């Protein structure tokens, strides 16, 4: 057994961070109530919507 390096742990920890990244965004959406909040969720979605908000204003 390769005792120095734990490959199955390396696969697991990255997989854990992937679900952690997914988990943290869902908390943001529920805390705010909007699917797109910051830059990164959708480049066009934030851009297209912002025109409607000012038009509504």
């Amino acid at each position: 057994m390769i005792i120095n390096h734990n490959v199955s742990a390396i696969f697991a920890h990255r997989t854990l961070k992937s679900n952690d990244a997914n988990l943290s965004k869902d908390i943001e959406k529920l805390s705010s109530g909007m699917r797109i909040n910051k830059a990164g969720d959708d480049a066009s979605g934030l851009a297209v919507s912002e025109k409607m908000r000012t038009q509504i204003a």
């Binding site: 988990l23 943290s24 908390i27 529920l30 805390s31 705010s32 109530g33």
Partner: protein
């Protein structure tokens, strides 16, 4: 003068006074939105404890 007195007061009402029916749309809006933020506040708090296993 009296005809203007009504018209001036009606003119002031539009800028100053608020539509109670329309306003309650927002009071309930931020009442529920406060529930989502408060209920999900502890869900993130319980997220951290899962690493102690």
């Amino acid at each position: 003068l009296m005809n203007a007195y009504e018209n001036t007061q009606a003119s002031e009402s539009r800028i100053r006074d608020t539509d109670m029916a329309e306003q309650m749309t927002s009071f309930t809006r931020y009442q529920i939105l406060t529930q989502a933020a408060t209920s999900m506040l502890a869900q993130a708090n319980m997220k951290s404890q899962s690493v102690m296993r």
